[PDB]
Amino acid sequence: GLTEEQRMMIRELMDAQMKTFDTTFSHFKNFRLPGVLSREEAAKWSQVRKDLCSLKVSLQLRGEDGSVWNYKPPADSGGKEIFSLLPHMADMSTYMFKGIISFAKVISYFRDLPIEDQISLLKGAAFELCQLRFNTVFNAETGTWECGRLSYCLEQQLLLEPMLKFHYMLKKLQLHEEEYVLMQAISLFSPDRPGVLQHRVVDQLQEQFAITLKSYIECNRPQPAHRFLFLKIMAMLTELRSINAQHTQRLLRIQDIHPFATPLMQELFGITSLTERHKILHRLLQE
């Protein structure tokens, strides 16, 4: 069984997730939508075109009245059209990042850290926590992320893209809500994020969440069958960390030639003292 402490750790994470994860995206509003519309630089563009190809989705918006708007992105032609969904995706990402910041803030263990460590951990884990939450709304039979009234439908070859293969593989583990949130806590309290100062304290907090998850699995899942479920989860978190680094690099390349990041995204991703370089994040953690 779980110790009283492990049970309480899970309760706090579950309370934090229930208060800050808008699972139906009911409060995601006022977002932008695609509208009715040289040697070195050429290289930059070429790498970017590749960057965008992989994650191509159509967008579906279901109205209250029963109507449906569907958006099929353009094929890659000359150029600029390839960025048509960027403003929308920047709004969705920003909305998800705010929910991830709120999550962390409700956690005692996280609040007890020095503000600059709170900042450093959130910058290092934001994308990872967003992907873990998006996996819960991922429909693997249709290749769709079902976000309330919004849906993003992917447009063997897919498995080639590390982010898609991650969603398929994680979904197949059929995790419990508790296991997802513990995964979120482990990613969040990663002692090795750039700029972390209380490395030892974070490292120990991470080990506690990892032990709680290992014990949750031993106690709540049928024996032999789920013998290596904890290790498969840890492998998925290692892979997610690699996808996060690949993502940041892709984001920076795109931003370089076609700015689209929101102010909060700029802070999270390093786009243009640690509290002075992250005033928005600081204010969000301060309130």
CA distance 38 to 75: 23
Q: Does 7 count as an annotated binding residue?
A: no
Per domain, the residue ranges of the chain are 1-287
- Packing angle between helix 4-20 and helix 86-106, nearest 10 degrees? 140
- What does the block give as tokens for 105? 């803030």
CA distance 273 to 287: 20
Residue pair 219/2 in contact by the 8 Å Cβ criterion: yes
Closest CA to 153 of 163, 143, 139: 143
Provide the 3-class DSSP secondary structure of residue 70.
strand
Residue pair 141/151 in contact by the 8 Å Cβ criterion: no
Place of tokens 């995206």: 25
Residue pair 247/127 in contact by the 8 Å Cβ criterion: yes
Please enumerate, as own/partner, the contacts of 269-278 that have beta carbons within 8 Å and a separation of 24 or more.
269/123, 270/123, 274/116, 274/119, 274/120, 274/195, 275/115, 275/116, 275/119, 278/119, 278/123
CA-based torsion, 155, 159, 162, 167: positive or negative? positive
Q: Does 93 count as an annotated binding residue?
A: yes
CA distance 101 to 182: 16
CA distance 260 to 99: 20
CA-based torsion, 6, 12, 16, 19: positive or negative? positive
Alpha helices, DSSP H only, in the chain? 4-20, 40-53, 86-106, 108-111, 115-136, 162-172, 177-188, 199-220, 229-257, 263-269, 279-286
Distance of CA 89 to the CA centre of its chain: 12
CA distance 265 to 260: 9
DSSP class of 26: T
CA distance 107 to 216: 19
- Packing angle between helix 4-20 and helix 199-220, nearest 10 degrees? 100
Q: Does 166 count as an annotated binding residue?
A: no
Closest CA to 107 of 96, 121, 95, 93: 121
Q: Does 227 count as an annotated binding residue?
A: no
Q: Does 60 count as an annotated binding residue?
A: no
Residue pair 57/152 in contact by the 8 Å Cβ criterion: yes
Kindly give, in sequence order, each residue whose CB lies less than 8 Å from that of residue 109, ignoring residues fewer than 6 positions away. 189, 205
Angle at the Cα of 265 from the Cα atoms of 157 and 202, rounded to 5 degrees? 90
Distance of CA 82 to the CA centre of its chain: 22
In angstroms, this model's resolution equals 2.0
Structure determined by:
X-ray
Q: Give whole-number Cα distances, 92 to 98, 100, 128, 210, in Å.
A: 10, 12, 15, 29
Kindly indicate whether the domain formed by 1-287 is annotated with CATH number 1.10.565.10. yes
CA distance 208 to 75: 48
Q: Does 131 count as an annotated binding residue?
A: yes
- Packing angle between helix 115-136 and helix 162-172, nearest 10 degrees? 70
Provide the CB-side half-sphere exposure for 60 (13 A, CA). 15
| Amino acid identity at 245 | A
Burial class (CB in 10 A: 0-12, 13-18, 19+), 252: middle
Cα Rg for the chain, rounded, in angstroms?
20
CA distance 95 to 148: 14
Residue pair 105/285 in contact by the 8 Å Cβ criterion: yes
